[PDB]
Amino acid sequence: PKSTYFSLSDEKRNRVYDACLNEFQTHSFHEAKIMHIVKALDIPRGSFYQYFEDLKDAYFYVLSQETLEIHDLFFNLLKDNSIEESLDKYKYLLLENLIDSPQYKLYKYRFLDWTYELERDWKPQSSATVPASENDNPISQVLKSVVHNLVYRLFSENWTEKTFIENYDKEIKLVTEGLLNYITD
Amino acid sequence: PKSTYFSLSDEKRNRVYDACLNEFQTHSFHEAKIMHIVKALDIPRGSFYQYFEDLKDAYFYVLSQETLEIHDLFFNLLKDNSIEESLDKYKYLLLENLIDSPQYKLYKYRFLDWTYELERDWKPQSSATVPASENDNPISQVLKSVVHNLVYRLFSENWTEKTFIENYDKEIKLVTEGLLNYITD
Ligand code: HEM
Ligand code: HEM
Ligand SMILES: C[As](C)(=O)[O-]
Ligand SMILES: C[As](C)(=O)[O-]
Numbered sequence: 586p587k588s589t590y591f592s593l594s595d596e597k598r599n600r601v602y603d604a605c606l607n608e609f610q611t612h613s614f615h616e617a618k619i620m621h622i623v624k625a626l627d628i629p630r631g632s633f634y635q636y637f638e639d640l641k642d643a644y645f646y647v648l649s650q651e652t653l654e655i656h657d658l659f660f661n662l663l664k665d666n667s668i669e670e671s672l673d674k675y676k677y678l679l680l681e682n683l684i685d686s687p688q689y690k691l692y693k694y695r696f697l698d699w700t701y702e703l704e705r706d707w708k709p710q711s712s713a714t715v716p717a718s719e720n721d722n723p724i725s726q727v728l729k730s731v732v733h734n735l736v737y738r739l740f741s742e743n744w745t746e747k748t749f750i751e752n753y754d755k756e757i758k759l760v761t762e763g764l765l766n767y768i769t770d
Numbered sequence: 771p772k773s774t775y776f777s778l779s780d781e782k783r784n785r786v787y788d789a790c791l792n793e794f795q796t797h798s799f800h801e802a803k804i805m806h807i808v809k810a811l812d813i814p815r816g817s818f819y820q821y822f823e824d825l826k827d828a829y830f831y832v833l834s835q836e837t838l839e840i841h842d843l844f845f846n847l848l849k850d851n852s853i854e855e856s857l858d859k860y861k862y863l864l865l866e867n868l869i870d871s872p873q874y875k876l877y878k879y880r881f882l883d884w885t886y887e888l889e890r891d892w893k894p895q896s897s898a899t900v901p902a903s904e905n906d907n908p909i910s911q912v913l914k915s916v917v918h919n920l921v922y923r924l925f926s927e928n929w930t931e932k933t934f935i936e937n938y939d940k941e942i943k944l945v946t947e948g949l950l951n952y953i954t955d
Contacts, residue, residue: 698885698886699884699885699886700883700885700886701882701884704882708926723937723941723944723952724944724949726916727949729919730918731916734914734915752908759908759909760912760945760948760949761949761950762948763945763947763948763951764909764912764946764948765854765946767908767909
C-alpha cells in the first residue's frame with residue numbers, strides 16, 4: 586500500500602484493513618471490487634487510491650498480513666515446544682484459525698483461484714512471511730509441502746474437520762517417524 | 771478427445787498427438803492456438819474439431835498422458851526397488867525426462883500458468899494418473915507434496931541441475947529418516 590495508508594491512525598487504518606479483508610473473505614480476487622470496499626467504508630472511491638495503487642495492492646497486503654499470522658501460529662510454538670509437539674498443537678490452531686474462520690474463504694481463493702498473472706506480480710514484491718532462517722532450510726520446505734497440501738485438499742475436496750484431522754495425523758506422523766519407520770510399523 | 775481421434779491409425783493418431791504435444795511444449799495454454807496445430811499437421815481446421823472438442827480437450831489429454839508417464843517413471847521402480855532406492859533413482863530419471871527435456875516447458879506452464887478455470891474443468895473429467903491404491907495413501911501424499919514442491923521451485927527459481935539435486939537429496943533424506951532422526955544427526 587502507499588505511504589498515506591501507513592500514515593493513517595491505528596483506528597482508521599485498522600478499519601480500512603478490515604474492509605479490505607472482509608472483501609477478500611467474501612470474493613475471489615477476480616470478483617472483488619474497489620467500489621465494494623469504499624461503499625463499506627462510506628468514503629469516496631478516490632480515497633481508495635490514496636491508500637493503494639489498485640485492488641491487487643490491497644489484496645497482496647491482506648494476503649501477506651494474514652499469512653504471516655497463520656505461519657506465526659506454527660513458528661511461535663517452536664520457541665516453547667519440540668517440533669513434533671508444535672505440529673500436533675498446530676493442527677488445532679488451524680481448526681480455530683482456518684476452518685472455523687472467515688479466513689477459510691480467503692485461503693480457498695488463494696489456493697484455488699491463483700493465476701500466473703497474480704504470481705508474476707506477487708513474487709517480486711513479496712517480503713518473507715516466514716522467519717529469515719526458515720526459508721532456506723529443508724525442514725521448512727518439507728513441512729510447507731505437506732501442510733500446504735493438506736490445506737489444498739481440505740479446500741479442494743471440501744473435507745469435514747474430522748477428515749482433515751485424520752489425514753494431518755497420518756501424514757505428519759509419516760513425516761515425523763520417516764518413511765522407513767512408518768513402513769516397519 | 772472424441773471417438774474419431776481414438777479411431778485414427780496408430781501412425782496418424784501419434785502424429786496428431788505429437789503436434790498437440792509440441793504446441794503445448796512451446797506455448798502456455800493461454801498462448802496456444804488450434805490454428806498452430808492444424809498448420810503443423812497441414813490439415814483443415816475443421817479436422818481438429820473431429821478429434822477434440824476444443825483446445826482444452828487436447829491440452830487435458832496431453833497433460834494426462836505425459837503425467838502418467840512421469841509418474842510411472844517413479845511407480846514402476848517400486849516393483850523392483852525399496853521405496854528409498856526408487857526415490858534416489860527417480861531423481862536421475864527426472865534429470866533425463868524433465869529437466870533436459872521438451873517437457874520442462876510443458877510442466878513449467880502446468881505448474882505456474884494454471885487457473886481456477888482450468889482446475890474447474892480439469893478435476894471432474896480427470897482419470898487417475900497414479901496407481902489405484904496410490905491415491906488414498908499417506909505415503910503417496912507426502913511424496914507428492916515434497917516432490918511436486920521441488921519441481922515447482924525448480925521452475926519458479928530457475929534452478930540449475932546441481933541445485934535441484936542438492937535440495938532433492940536433503941529433502942528426500944529428511945522424508946526417509948524422518949524429522950526426528952534428521953534433527954538428532
Ligand atoms: C507448518 C505449517 C507451514 C509451514 C512450515 C509453511 C511454510 C511456508 C513457506 C516456507 C512459505 C514460503 C515459500 C518459499 O518462499 O519458499 C510459505 C508460503 C505461503 N504459505 Fe505456508 N506454511 C505452513 C502452513 C500454511 C497454512 C496453514 C497456510 C494457509 C492456510 C499457508 C499459506 C501460505 C501462503 C498463502 C504462502 C504464499 C506463497 C505460497 O503460496 O507458497 N501456509 N509457507
Ligand atoms: C515421487 C514422485 C511423485 C508422486 C508420488 C506424485 C504423486 C501425485 C499424485 C498422488 C497426484 C494426484 C493427486 C491426488 O489426486 O490426490 C499427482 C498429480 C499430478 N502430478 Fe505428481 N507425483 C510425483 C511427481 C511428479 C512430477 C515430477 C511431476 C511433473 C513434473 C508431477 C506432476 C503432476 C501433475 C501435473 C498432476 C495433476 C494434478 C496436480 O497438479 O496435483 N508429479 N501426483
Ligand atoms: C497494522 As495493519 C495489519 O492494520 O495494516
Ligand atoms: C496412444 As496416444 C498417447 O498417441 O493418444
